[PDB]
């Protein structure tokens, strides 16, 4: 079933992109979100230890004890994001090992953040053929979120690192 | 390269569908076309022996010596088309063996005809992993034609027969 699903999605059976609104729990401790979700982090049902801010602006949450890690990226078709895949995925893996909730976010919660979450999931996959796992994670996340790594340059970088 | 191509196409990097206009030579003797292409068959640069008419109407070309084979199908999401895959692909294979040009057509040259051409190409593949070959043929034909088996029920039937 999941296989027929992947092949139909892969041949144009996708919905038009829609903006995510709510935070998504991706793993036990790793969450994916947009800017509003980051602003709402301190009051979230989840007790975040970390927020990974992938936007260009270095904001603060001065009334919170959250540690905000800033990795400034631009959502464009020219930026290398792959230079940070190894260190970001190692950091997210450590958050999961230590049960330290972390919110990975960008402005829209689609491209810079979606790409780091896709990299994390690919990095954690030791079981499945990378090509199949990539299609599965891509489409299942997109169906859940509404839009997920729409930026084709970011998708290309994920494919180069984890599939090719 | 062809691999990176497939994976980007498979994750939403496709163009909006556009109607095919000109006939496409798919193999040495097998061509894919719309209704206008069928009407223009007798005067074509190609000396067709056969036209496979997949539309519901049994037309004639009374001034031509073309043999018109009628397999009436509807382009809808309910029709089994798979019941004819074995006999159609065997017939197309025979046209290629005998160097007898054949035009496979529907009304739009996209769905009923595109699906029989995709089935033919899958049937002729003995070399490549079916999942990869399916994605390659699908996307390469769609890029060439503008639109190619957009009907998701027909795609599902191809996947069931030749991939699963």
From Swiss-Prot, chains A, B:
Name the record gives this protein: Dual specificity protein phosphatase OPG106
Q: One Pfam family for this entry, by name?
A: DSPc
Q: Which UniProt keywords apply?
A: Host cytoplasm, Host-virus interaction, Hydrolase, Inhibition of host innate immune response by virus, Inhibition of host interferon signaling pathway by virus, Inhibition of host STAT1 by virus, Interferon antiviral system evasion, Late protein, Protein phosphatase, Viral immunoevasion, Virion
* An example Gene Ontology molecular-function term: phosphatase activity
Uppermost EC category: hydrolase
Briefly, what is this protein's role? Serine/tyrosine phosphatase which down-regulates cellular antiviral response by dephosphorylating activated host STAT1 and blocking interferon (IFN)-stimulated innate immune responses. Dephosphorylates the OPG144 protein.
Please state where this protein is localized.
Virion; Host cytoplasm
Entry EC number(s): 3.1.3.-, 3.1.3.48
What family does the database annotate? Belongs to the protein-tyrosine phosphatase family. Non-receptor class dual specificity subfamily.
Q: Name its species.
A: Vaccinia virus (strain Western Reserve) (VACV)
Q: Which reaction does it catalyse?
A: O-phospho-L-tyrosyl-[protein] + H2O = L-tyrosyl-[protein] + phosphate; O-phospho-L-seryl-[protein] + H2O = L-seryl-[protein] + phosphate
């Amino acid at each position: 079933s999941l296989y027929k699903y992947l092949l139909l999605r892969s041949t144009g059976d996708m919905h038009k992109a829609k903006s995510p609104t709510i935070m998504t729990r991706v793993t036990n401790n790793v969450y994916l979100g947009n800017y509003k979700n980051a602003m709402d982090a301190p009051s979230s049902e989840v007790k975040f230890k970390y927020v990974l801010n992938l936007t260009m602006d270095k904001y603060t949450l001065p009334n919170s004890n959250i540690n905000i890690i800033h990795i400034p990226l631009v959502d464009d078709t020219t930026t290398d994001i792959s230079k940070y895949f190894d260190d970001v995925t190692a950091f997210l893996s450590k958050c999961d090992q230590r049960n330290e909730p972390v919110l990975v976010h960008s402005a829209a919660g689609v491209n810079r953040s979606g790409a780091m979450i896709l990299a994390y999931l690919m990095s954690k996959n030791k079981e499945s053929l990378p090509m199949l796992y990539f299609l599965y994670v891509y489409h299942s996340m997109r169906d859940l979120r509404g839009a997920f790594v729409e930026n084709p340059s970011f998708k290309r970088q994920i494919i180069e690192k984890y599939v090719i």
